């Protein structure tokens, strides 16, 4: 029937003055466009079919051609930016928004999907979709007493599309749009479907990826406890964005960071910092590094939750990028910590693995580690214990590495090392 049509035959059917011939040809186009191997998107665009598809979106008396055209355009918009632009340039945005209110659930859903692809292209198209008034009708589709009454695929698509309206920066989405969307997002974040939860977490991770003011908008909605709960989920597609969101939040103020701690986030970290998925371990360690950049009472919570041994662990053995985040966690800890907290660090065995990493080629991690060592020595100075530390560092081959770093070509490195040598190793 409509399987494997040539583009010329599709054009012929669409240019016929016959609505049923146009429907068949549009369906043929939809099938070409939904084939996994190189759908001929550019050939379809070149044939000038987008404006025709867009006009078909308005055919209220022929819902089948609305659906087929909506599907065809969705798949063109799913392509490159240039391909998405062709769809927008054809006037698709207002046409799809009008379709959100369709009495046909499958058509409304397709329009949600298409708008998701358009918004997903970038900040400009996202903002243009918002300007055409998409948010109101989208939110209206979710204005039900219990989300569980909605078709699963339908809910997932709405969640995903809303996440794209939250996505991207330079600029971030309009403050008013974010305020408008958040209460619905908070609701979706409490739903029970893993895909809805994952995409709700993605949206929250985008919204918290910015200045403290953007973080505050989210934190004020009280979602942190739910994020921490999702941090403990078994589904990796949920934990990944949940953890990015939590990590973003702790890049904010000390107070915003405290809400994460208050919600019990630290108790999940023994598992996160030993997680078999490398990226989870890395993001969790990054997150830890920002928490140890906090107040002394927050560093103390890290101590109380027994997380210093886990940091020693990651520093001792982990993917290198993870070890780098650990190094940062330690330097931040030593920067803001009390003498007793810093001493505890040494007692947990931080020195040897810290020394071992000085063989790294990465210039920045070397600077970070040397800073930590300087900080630790400072604490020791205030206890008259520099000698015993000097010996510790020498016993594990640390002094050898620091001595060599005087020959390091980077200025700040061969400076910092010289300073340590001439001040504690004479």
């Amino acid at each position: 029937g409509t399987v494997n049509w040539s583009v010329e035959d599709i054009v012929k059917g669409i240019n016929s003055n016959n609505l049923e011939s146009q429907l068949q040809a549009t369906q043929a186009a939809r099938k070409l466009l939904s084939r996994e191997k190189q759908p001929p998107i550019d050939n379809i665009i070149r044939a000038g079919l987008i404006p025709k598809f867009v006009s078909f979106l308005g055919k209220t008396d022929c819902s089948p051609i609305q659906f087929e055209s909506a599907w065809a355009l969705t798949n063109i918009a799913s392509g490159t930016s240039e391909q998405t632009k062709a769809v927008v340039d054809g006037g698709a945005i207002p046409a799809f928004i009008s379709l959100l209110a369709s009495p046909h659930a499958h058509i409304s859903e397709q329009a949600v999907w298409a708008l998701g692809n358009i918004a997903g292209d970038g900040s400009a198209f996202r903002d243009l979709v918002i300007k055409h008034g998409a948010i109101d009708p989208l939110l209206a589709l979710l204005a039900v007493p219990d989300l569980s009454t909605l078709a699963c695929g339908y809910l997932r698509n709405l969640t995903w599309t809303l996440s794209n309206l939250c996505r991207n920066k330079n600029p971030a989405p309009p403050l008013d749009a974010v305020e408008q969307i958040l209460p619905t997002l908070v609701r979706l974040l409490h739903h029970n479907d893993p895909e809805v939860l994952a995409d709700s977490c993605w949206a929250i991770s985008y919204l918290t990826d910015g200045p403290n003011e953007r973080i505050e908008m989210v934190v004020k909605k009280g979602v942190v406890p739910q994020l921490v709960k999702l941090l403990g989920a078994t589904e990796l597609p949920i934990v990944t964005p949940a953890l990015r969101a939590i990590g973003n939040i702790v890049t904010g103020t000390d107070e915003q960071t405290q809400k994460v701690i208050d919600a019990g986030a630290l108790a999940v970290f023994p598992s996160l910092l030993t997680n078999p998925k490398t990226n989870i371990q890395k993001e969790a360690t990054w997150t830890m590094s920002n928490i140890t950049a906090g107040r002394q009472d927050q560093i103390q919570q890290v101590v109380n939750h027994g997380l210093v041994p886990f940091l020693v662990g990651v520093l001792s053995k982990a993917d290198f990028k993870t070890q780098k985040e650990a190094a940062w966690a330690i330097t931040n800890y030593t920067s803001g910590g009390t003498v007793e907290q810093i001493v505890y660090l040494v007692h947990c065995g931080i020195i040897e693995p810290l020394m071992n990493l000085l063989s790294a080629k990465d210039t920045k991690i070397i600077q970070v580690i040397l800073d930590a060592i300087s900080n630790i020595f400072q604490a020791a100075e205030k206890l008259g214990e520099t000698e015993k530390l000097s010996i510790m560092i020498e016993e594990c081959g640390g002094l050898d590495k620091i001595e060599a770093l005087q020959r390091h070509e980077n200025e700040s490195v061969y400076k910092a090392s010289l300073n340590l040598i001439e001040k504690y190793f004479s």
Binding site: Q110, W113, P241, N332
Partner: peptide
Amino acid sequence: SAVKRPAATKKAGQAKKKKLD
């Protein structure tokens, strides 16, 4: 003297989706 650091890498869900059926 500890400064907070934003993520080094972009992390996001799928920006666009093709409908297969």
